Design a protein around this ligand. Structure first.
Ligand SMILES: Nc1ncnc2c1ncn2[C@@H]1O[C@H](COP(=O)(O)OP(=O)(O)OP(O)(O)=S)[C@@H](O)[C@H]1O
Lengths: 681, 123, 268, 41, 319
């Protein structure tokens, strides 16, 4: 114990240099030898070795043997520390994963790696199943071979935990990923053949119900028209709309596809013929007729898209409604400690939600007689929502092992996210929740109050509101919020309650669930928090956040309408949490969540480093290439130490929380928001 | 209990176990529609509000088998409601009919030949 | 129309008198209510009393919607006298549930003496041990005009509702929204802010020596803080030259200080 | 009139006296009778 | 028309710029400014044209003739123009844009190319020419004051207090002081260049005068350099002295009623050649004329249909 205290205090006094590292290393090795059954000493030794690797790598970036000398005992101590926890070892597993991915090709680190895979149990990899599959197409032989061996062991022991991302990765466009996934899948048919075929059938069948043929052609033509008439890139629109001709050339298989073929197939063939005539002998005389035909098809498709409001399975996908029993599990619900729920039936009618992306409403029926309602999403990448759900589960586990937050029941409400491809997926449906916009809308429609009364006052005081300077917009915004009593949410939440005790408990839950999500969204960098992205649970009062598409302060650094606020804290959310203000439950809950996130900064740092450094997922944050990821992880490290507002000082938890409160509820920052964000609500 | 010695022994056992903190007690450990109807959360107009709350009040005594003495008058009151409303008494069917048929199944005696008869009037 | 002989009888004295009064009130309310439903359910309500209890609010609002100005004015006067006359839990819970049922409607709350009786009903809700209702009524009183008494009662209500952080927010509002140091040391006493209450009591006593209840609070602060030495020193310097109604209040703290220092001879 | 860049980016000695005349005068202030102000009132 | 020794105009959100004279408060010409609002307007020192700048264009309006159209329009910037100004002999334009730039324009249809750009890391809110027509003050949304001399190409940056956006700055024509206000009401006054010889540009902070609890939107000296008026968002306009920097005069448009709740801010003000009567622009859809001594208003012009945020008042040099 005192050797560990010596190492920690020497690190806290003198930092990390080339003179203190062997001293804290010998202290940590003395502590591990003095105990040999302590998770803390082995963990501190392994993180000290990893920090030595990081420091000696960053020093020669501004030899490969000292890095070896500090990486091999790092992997050894981390694989030793994995087996000591037995309940929660996500950070150690991500550390052995990043060491595996960066230095797993060296022949000496491979020894410790292949010992560690055979040493520890097989369930401890079930938490890092996506992060493994993101590196399945590595161009190095031995690390890729050991990845393939581990994935085959996971598929042999736990076949249900790996079959969905494997069938996701099989239907990719890159060569190495799809052939490695097909290889692991065809090795999976040895012990379980019906499950792989049923899973491929189900995935390939409800990837078609997500985006139909006319929606695919509408999206492709809308992309190619913008590309050709804005960038003059003929070889870009060619690669945009030739896979559509490729998937249309294999024959229609359903009645809807045959209907689309009988309607538009002659025009979509003659346009391809004119495009080929242009591509052989270059002249715009051949491209203008093809684009005329494409615009005719686009204008005929775009008129029948608001009419789509329901889908029958006999017309869209005739293979889904004739299953009647399956070996697949219900997606999003599988744990190795409970009996599995298999997919029994699928409802033969889906309701399409009228929006700009049109999400379907799928509802399966499990083996235990319970209906599982889902949301079949198209035109969206659901690979970010899965990672932020893993982060939210980690944060829930962190808040669960703390005494002062467990007695206050602080947690984030999560939902299942099952991606199916690059542009389609399946979101779990949370019941009893209602949208924040769709609550104020009903309250104003019932109380005879107009919806855009604040916007109408703003446009009446000044017609050119969006073109003013900062001070003029501040004056118009203050005149709008002073001449309007904003108390819709408080009376709306009180009116829908049976008694006062339930109303008080729901208000307490609402405040202490808004504060946790505000601090976690500040640490993560959540943007675009308009009232259509916040939901209230009508039975428990808690707050549910959706649309995790703008993370890591992307919305702060955009060009047209950048937001200057960390989280959403407006006057309607403040007048409905208490009667004095936000200095009660809100500030104390923010202090608790911030100090919990600061005491466990290494775990959330490891999760966010595994998220950002993924080469197939960091394309949304870059609109060398590894410079932006570094300067984002540095910003995240500044947020978790109190060096975010100024680098020459270190702020504690109350000062940082007070600065965030003053920044989020300032009129000069709320006046610059987009009008759809509703800063007056 | 009322004996002072028993209460003294009870608080003696309570002290000898000894001062468990409340969170460990709470660790060791539909009916929502009636609460919304007796307070009128849905804000239905008052003319069609008294039948719903009277049906819940009749169903609260018609659910229990311990108080099987006033079953004839709650049944005749239910028939009175269903005849007095008219065509708008269809909304109370999912809450009145399973309890009615369960009571017909579980009861005994010469009230059964009554209940069926009243059930016919419901039909 | 014929309910004034049940409402304005003016003869209720004891507990069972009030219970049988609300009994007869419920039966004469459900008997003639201008609705076939409650009138038919009255015949069963004569035989079963909890059914007449749960059908009280609907019968009350159906009878209230038909009366005119004067009869409903005698009605609200009689319900005010029935509120402020007794102290039993069942009848007060019944009247509070009726008032919250009425204020949840579209017609607004039933008008009491002054501003729907939010000063009365909360004072009837604090003694009935229904603290959520009292907290809601004190918030409704706070929304009109803030005074230090409302903030002190908000602290007192939120402490027994197991909410220390809300009361801390009340103290924060009172300290950054008033700005004259009107904050009494009893406010820090309720929040268990023993150091701040101690600094407040030394701030209040060093300027002038005043009457008791000003050193008893300092004794309570130093006892709850855990300093037996200064507590016993301040007790021994004032034990003789003090009146009778203060030694009976300070004797247990004196015994606790003498035990904490181990002086059994003074503890006896 | 629109905007065009790359103007006078190489001549330093010419720009030292092209537009920076450094005209500093009118040091002596005098009193007045406020003709327009009294005429307006 | 503008054939008069004194002229007066106001501009705001009603899509018109009004010209009038302080004889009876009646409007003479209403010039039509559409598709944007006016941030700031300035008259040419030769008294031939006026210039209205707001949202990516600077529009000239003729003074001798009667033309309601923008005869000469300047475009090229991508956001608003906070303030504009001319050389005292009418040679070059200093225009501060919203985005990042303070630039110069050439007023003649010839390739003189005396135009330069000054680029900072913040949206700028105010520009001010030096009275010797050699230096220039830039004030942005980061509290920084860029003293940029047009002779050389290096600029000083001065930060009294970060995290607060400064709004205005001005130098008296006698070249005695330099005052500036920010978004919390603090008004710092530095002593300007005393080096008339070779433009050494030394600044020492004389005083900070704490007033104006709300936002302070514009601060201006007087041509006699004995008074300094500043307008703030508590519906007040206060004039201070340059002797010991105490409060000379307080003016307010507050009705004293809690039913108004800041019905209009104090946007702009200007002095006269005598420094005796001032004209103030409030956002209560009207402009006022006050005196620096008696306190009470003397005149009112209420022909506008929306708020007004800028006004121009120049008279003859004698006064
Ligand atoms: N996970 C969920 N649980 C319950 N309801 C949900 C859930 N996800 C979405 N919804 C509901 O579905 C509505 C519309 O779905 P969205 O996908 O948000 O529509 P959208 O506007 O196309 O989405 P974007 O990306 O914000 S434009 C949401 O506003 C909610 O009402």
């Amino acid at each position: 114990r005192c050797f560990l205290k010596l190492g920690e205090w020497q690190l806290n006094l003198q930092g990390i240099n080339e003179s203190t590292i062997p001293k804290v290393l010998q202290y940590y090795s003395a502590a591990t030898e003095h105990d040999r059954s302590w998770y803390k000493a082995w963990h501190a030794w392994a993180v000290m070795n990893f920090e030595a690797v990081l420091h000696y790598k960053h020093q020669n970036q501004a030899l490969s043997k000292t890095l070896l000398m500090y990486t091999v005992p790092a992997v050894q101590g981390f694989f030793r520390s994995i087996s000591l926890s037995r309940g929660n070892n996500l950070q150690d597993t991500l550390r052995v994963l990043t060491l595996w991915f960066d230095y797993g090709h060296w022949p000496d680190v491979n020894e410790a790696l292949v010992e560690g895979v055979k040493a520890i149990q097989i369930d401890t990899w079930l938490q890092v199943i996506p992060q493994l599959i993101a590196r399945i197409d590595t161009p190095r032989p031995l690390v890729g071979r050991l990845i393939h061996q581990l994935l085959t062991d996971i598929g042999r022991y736990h076949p249900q935990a790996l079959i969905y991302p494997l069938t996701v990765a099989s239907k990719s466009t890159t060569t190495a990923r799809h052939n490695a996934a097909n290889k692991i899948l065809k090795n999976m048919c040895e012990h379980s053949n019906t499950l792989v075929q049923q899973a491929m059938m189900v995935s390939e069948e409800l990837i078609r119900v997500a985006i139909l043929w006319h929606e695919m052609w509408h999206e492709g033509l809308e992309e190619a028209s913008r590309l050709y008439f804005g960038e003059r890139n003929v070889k870009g629109m060619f690669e945009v709309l030739e896979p559509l001709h490729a998937m249309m050339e294999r024959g229609p298989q359903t009645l809807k596809e045959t209907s689309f073929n009988q309607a538009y197939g002659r025009d979509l063939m003659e346009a391809q013929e004119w495009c080929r005539k242009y591509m052989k002998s270059g002249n715009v005389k051949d491209l203008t007729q093809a684009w005329d035909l494409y615009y005719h098809v686009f204008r005929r498709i775009s008129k029948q898209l608001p009419q789509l409001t329901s889908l029958e399975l006999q017309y869209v996908s005739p293979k889904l409604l004739m299953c009647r029993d399956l070996e697949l599990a219900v997606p999003g619900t599988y744990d190795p400690n409970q009996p599995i729920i298999r997919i029994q039936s699928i409802a033969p009618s889906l309701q399409v939600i009228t929006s700009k992306q049109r999400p379907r409403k799928l509802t399966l029926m499990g083996s235990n007689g319970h209906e599982f309602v889902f949301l079949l999403k198209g035109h969206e990448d659901l690979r970010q929502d899965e990672r932020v759900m893993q982060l939210f589960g980690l944060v829930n586990t962190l808040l669960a092992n703390d005494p002062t937050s467990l007695r206050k029941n602080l947690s984030i409400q999560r939902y299942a996210v099952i991606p199916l491809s690059t542009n389609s997926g399946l979101i779990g449906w949370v019941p009893h929740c209602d949208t924040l916009h769709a609550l104020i809308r009903d309250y104003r429609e019932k109380k005879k109050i107009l919806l855009n009364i604040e916007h109408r006052i703003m446009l009446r005081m000044a017609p050119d509101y969006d073109h003013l300077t900062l001070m003029q917009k501040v004056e118009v915004f203050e005149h709008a919020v002073n001449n309007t009593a904003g108390d819709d949410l408080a009376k709306l939440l009180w009116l829908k309650s049976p008694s006062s005790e339930v109303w008080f408990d729901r208000r307490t839950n609402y405040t202490r669930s808004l504060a946790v999500m505000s601090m976690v969204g500040y640490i993560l960098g959540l943007g675009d928090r308009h009232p259509s992205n916040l939901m209230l649970d009508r039975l428990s009062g808690k707050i549910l956040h959706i649309d995790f598409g703008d993370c890591f302060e992307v919305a702060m650094t955009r060009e047209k309408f950048p937001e200057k606020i960390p989280f959403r804290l407006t006057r309607m959310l403040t007048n409905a949490m208490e009667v004095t203000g936000l200095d009660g439950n809100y500030r104390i809950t923010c202090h608790t969540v911030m100090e919990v996130l600061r005491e466990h900064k290494d775990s959330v740092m490891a999760v966010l480093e595994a998220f950002v450094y993924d080469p197939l997922l960091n394309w949304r944050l870059m609109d060398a290439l590894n410079k932006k990821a570094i300067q984002i992880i540095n910003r995240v490290r500044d947020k978790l130490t109190g060096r975010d507002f100024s680098h020459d000082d270190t702020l504690d938890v109350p000062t940082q929380v007070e600065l965030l409160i003053k920044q989020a509820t300032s009129h000069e920052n709320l006046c610059q928001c987009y009008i759809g964000w509703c800063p007056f609500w | 209990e009322q004996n002072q010695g028993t209460r003294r022994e009870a608080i003696r056992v309570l002290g000898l176990l000894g001062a468990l903190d409340p969170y460990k007690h709470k660790v060791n450990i539909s009916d929502y529609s009636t609460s919304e109807m007796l307070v009128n959360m849905g804000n239905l107009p008052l003319d069609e509000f008294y039948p719903a709350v009277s049906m819940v009040a009749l169903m609260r005594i018609f659910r229990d088998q311990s108080l099987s003495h006033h079953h004839t008058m709650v049944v005749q009151a239910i028939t009175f409601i269903f005849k007095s409303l008219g065509l708008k008494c269809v909304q109370f069917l999912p809450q009145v009919m399973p309890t009615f048929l369960n009571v017909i199944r579980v009861c005994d005696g010469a009230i059964r030949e009554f209940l069926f008869q009243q059930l016919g009037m419901l039909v | 129309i014929n309910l004034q002989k049940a409402w304005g009888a003016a003869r209720r004295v004891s507990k069972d008198d009030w219970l049988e009064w609300l009994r007869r009130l419920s039966l004469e309310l459900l008997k003639d209510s201008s609705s076939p439903s409650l009138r038919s359910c009255w015949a069963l309500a004569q035989a079963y009393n909890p059914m007449a209890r749960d059908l009280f609010n609907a019968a009350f609002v159906s009878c209230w919607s038909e009366l005119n100005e004067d009869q409903q004015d005698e009605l609200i006067r009689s319900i005010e006298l029935a509120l402020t006359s007794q102290d039993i839990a069942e009848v007060t819970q019944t009247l509070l549930n009726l008032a919250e049922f009425m204020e949840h409607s579209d017609k607004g709350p039933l008008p009491l003496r002054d501003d729907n009786g939010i000063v009365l009903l909360g004072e009837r809700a604090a003694k009935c041990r229904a603290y959520a209702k009292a907290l809601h009524y004190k918030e409704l009183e706070f929304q009109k005009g803030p005074t230090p008494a409302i903030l002190e009662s908000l602290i007192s209500i939120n402490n027994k509702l197991q909410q220390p952080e809300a009361a801390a927010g009340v103290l924060e509002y009172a300290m950054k929204h008033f700005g004259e140091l009107e904050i009494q040391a009893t406010w820090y006493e309720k929040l268990h802010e023993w150091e701040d209450a101690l600094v407040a009591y030394d701030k209040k006593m060093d300027t002038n020596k005043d009457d008791p209840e000003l050193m008893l609070g300092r004794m309570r602060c130093l006892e709850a803080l855990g300093e037996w030495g200064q507590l016993h020193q301040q007790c021994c310097e004032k034990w003789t030259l003090v009146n009778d109604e203060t030694q009976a209040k300070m004797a247990r703290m004196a015994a606790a200080a003498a035990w904490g220092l181990g002086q059994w001879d003074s503890m006896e | 009139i629109q905007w065009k860049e790359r103007n006078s980016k190489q001549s330093a000695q010419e720009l030292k006296s092209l537009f920076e005349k450094k005209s500093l005068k009118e040091k002596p202030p005098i009193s007045g009778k406020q003709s327009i102000l009294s005429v307006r009132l | 028309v503008g054939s008069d020794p004194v002229i007066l105009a106001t501009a705001g959100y009603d899509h018109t710029v009004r010209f009038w004279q302080a004889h009876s408060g009646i409007c003479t010409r209403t010039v039509q400014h559409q598709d944007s609002q006016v941030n700031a307007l300035e008259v040419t020192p030769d008294r031939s044209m006026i210039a209205a700048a707001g949202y990516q264009h600077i529009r000239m309006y003729d003074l001798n003739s009667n033309n309601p159209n923008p005869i000469i329009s300047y475009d090229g910037v991508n956001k608003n123009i906070a303030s504009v100004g001319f050389h005292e002999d009418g040679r070059w334009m200093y225009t501060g844009g919203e985005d990042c730039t303070a630039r110069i324009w050439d007023l003649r249809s010839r390739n003189l190319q005396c135009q330069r750009i000054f680029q900072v890391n913040a949206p700028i809110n105010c520009v001010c020419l030096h009275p010797n027509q050699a230096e220039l003050i830039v004030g942005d949304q980061s509290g920084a004051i860029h003293i940029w001399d047009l002779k050389t190409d290096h600029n000083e940056q001065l930060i009294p207090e970060p995290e607060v956006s400064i709004t205005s700055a001005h130098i008296d024509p006698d070249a005695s002081y330099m005052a500036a206000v920010n978004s919390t009401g603090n008004c710092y006054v530095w002593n300007l260049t005393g080096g008339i010889g070779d433009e050494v540009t030394q600044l020492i902070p004389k005083t900070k005068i704490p007033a104006h609890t709300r936002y302070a939107l514009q601060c201006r000296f007087s041509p006699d350099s004995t008074l300094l008026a500043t307008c703030s968002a508590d519906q007040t306009c206060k004039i201070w002295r340059t002797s010991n920097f105490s409060l000379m005069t307080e003016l307010s448009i507050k009705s004293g009623n809690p039913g108004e709740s800041s019905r209009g801010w104090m946007w702009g003000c200007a002095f006269s050649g005598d420094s005796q009567y001032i004209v103030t622009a409030s956002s209560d859809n009207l402009a006022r004329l006050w005196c620096v001594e008696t306190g009470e208003i003397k005149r009112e012009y209420g022909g506008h249909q929306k708020a007004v945020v800028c006004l121009a008042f120049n008279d003859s040099v004698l006064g």
